[PDB]
Design a protein around this ligand. Structure first.
Ligand SMILES: O=C(O)Cc1csc(Nc2cccc(CNC(=O)c3cc(Br)ccc3O)c2)n1
Ligand SMILES: [Zn+2]
Length: 351
C-alpha cells in the first residue's frame, strides 16, 4: 500500500516546487499593504510573522491559496480569561497608539478590524496594475481575503504580539519534553505569544495563536539534531502530516454540498499529529520504510479522538477541540465512517 502513498506524495511535490509567478505577485501586494499600514499611528509597528516567507499554505491540495499573518506588538498588555474558556481572553492595558480602539477597559477587536479592513480596501484601489478584489466575510480571523488576477487568493490575519510569559492555561501544555527535550520546551516558551480576533459564543474576545511554534516544531522534528540530514536518519514524520492534511482536504471537497465537515480543519489534524509524535518520541518509530504502518497509526489515533469525543489542545490541555459543545456527534460519526471506508479501500479519494 505504501507505493500508493509515495505516489500521492510524488504528485503533491510536482505542483509545489514548479515555476510560478504567483509567489512574487503575492509578495508585491503584501509589501504594498504593509507600507500603507505603517503610515497609521495605531498600525505603526506592523509586519509579517515570518519575514522572507510569505508563501505559507493551510491547503496542500490548493497551491494558489496563500495564508499570511500581520503581527503588531502590544506592550503594557494585561489579559482577563473569558468565561473559564481557557483560550479566549479580553485585552486590557496599563494614552496608547490603539487608544482609538478602547471600549471601557476592553480593546475593541471589531473597531480594530474595521480600521484594518478600511485601509486595505483603499490600498487595493491604488493598484491599477493587477485586479485585486477584497472579499468580506464573518469569523474574526482570517480578517480579510484578497483575490489577485484570478484564482490566486491570500488570507491576511491581524495578530497582537506579547513579549511576556505565556498565560497560566499553557502551564501543562506543549508536552515535548520526552521528544524534542526540556531545554527546547524552556526556549520556545521564552518566545512571544500571539492573539487573533476570535468570537466565542457580542463579546470582543481574542484567542491564543501558536502558528510560530508549530512551524518551529515541524522544521526541527526529530529527537536527533541530524534527523533527515542523512541516509541513516530518514524519517516519515512530515509525510505523515502531509497525507493526513491531504485526506481531510479531499473528503471536505467531496462533501462540500453537505455541512458535516465544515467544522473540521487542518488544525484538528496538526493537534492530533503532535499528540502521536509525543506518544512515539523516538526517530526509530518513524523510519521511512514504515510509512504505511506510521500513517495507519496516525489515522487510528485521529479516529479514536472522533469516537471518544476527546482531542486536547496541544498548548492549552483543558481545552477539548472535539467536545459536543463545539462539534456535534453526528458530524464526527460522518467523518469516522468516511475515513474508515477510505482506509479499508486503500484511499480512493487520493486517486
Ligand atoms: O481560525 C479557525 O477557525 C481555525 C483554527 C485555528 S486555531 C483554532 N482553534 C483553537 C481553539 C482554542 C485554542 C487555540 C490555541 N491555538 C492552537 O492550538 C494552535 C494549534 C496549531 Br497546530 C497551530 C496554531 C494554533 O494557534 C486554537 N481554530
Ligand atoms: Zn526526520
Amino acid at each position: 500500500g505504501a507505493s500508493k502513498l509515495r505516489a500521492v506524495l510524488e504528485k503533491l511535490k510536482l505542483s509545489r516546487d514548479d515555476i510560478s509567478t504567483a509567489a512574487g505577485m503575492v509578495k508585491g501586494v503584501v509589501d504594498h499593504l504593509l507600507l500603507r499600514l505603517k503610515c497609521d499611528s495605531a498600525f505603526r509597528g506592523v509586519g509579517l510573522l515570518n519575514t522572507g516567507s510569505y508563501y505559507e499554505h493551510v491547503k496542500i491540495s490548493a497551491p494558489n491559496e496563500f495564508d499570511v499573518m500581520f503581527k503588531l506588538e502590544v506592550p503594557r498588555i494585561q489579559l482577563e480569561e473569558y468565561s473559564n474558556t481557557r483560550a479566549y481572553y479580553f485585552v486590557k492595558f496599563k494614552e496608547n497608539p490603539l487608544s482609538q480602539f478602547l471600549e471601557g477597559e476592553i480593546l475593541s477587536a471589531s473597531k480594530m478590524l474595521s480600521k484594518f479592513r478600511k485601509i486595505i480596501k483603499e490600498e487595493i484601489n491604488d493598484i491599477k496594475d493587477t485586479d485585486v478584489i477584497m472579499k468580506r466575510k464573518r469569523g474574526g480571523s482570517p480578517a480579510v481575503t484578497l483575490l489577485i488576477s484570478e484564482k490566486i487568493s491570500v488570507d491576511i490575519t491581524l495578530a497582537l504580539e506579547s513579549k511576556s510569559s505565556w498565560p497560566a492555561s499553557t502551564q501543562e501544555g506543549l508536552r515535548i519534553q520526552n521528544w524534542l527535550s526540556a531545554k527546547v520546551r524552556k526556549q520556545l516558551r521564552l518566545k512571544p505569544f500571539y492573539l487573533v480576533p476570535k468570537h466565542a459564543k457580542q463579546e470582543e474576545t481574542w484567542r491564543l495563536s501558536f502558528s510560530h511554534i508549530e512551524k518551529e516544531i515541524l522544521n526541527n522534528h526529530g529527537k536527533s539534531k541530524t534527523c533527515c540530514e542523512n541516509k541513516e536518519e530518514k524519517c516519515c514524520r512530515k509525510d505523515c502530516l502531509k497525507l493526513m492534511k491531504y485526506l481531510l482536504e479531499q473528503l471536505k471537497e467531496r462533501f462540500k454540498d453537505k455541512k458535516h465537515l465544515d467544522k473540521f480543519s487542518s488544525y484538528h489534524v496538526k493537534t492530533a499529529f503532535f499528540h502521536v509524535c509525543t506518544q512515539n518520541p523516538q526517530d526509530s518509530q518513524w523510519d521511512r520504510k514504515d510509512l504505511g504502518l506510521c500513517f495507519d497509526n496516525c489515522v487510528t489515533y485521529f479516529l479514536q479522538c472522533l469516537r471518544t469525543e476527546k482531542l486536547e489542545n496541544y498548548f492549552i490541555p483543558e481545552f477539548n477541540l472535539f467536545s459536543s459543545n463545539l462539534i456535534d456527534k453526528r458530524s464526527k460519526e460522518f467523518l469516522t465512517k468516511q475515513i474508515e471506508y477510505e482506509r479499508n479501500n486503500e484511499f480512493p479519494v487520493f486517486d
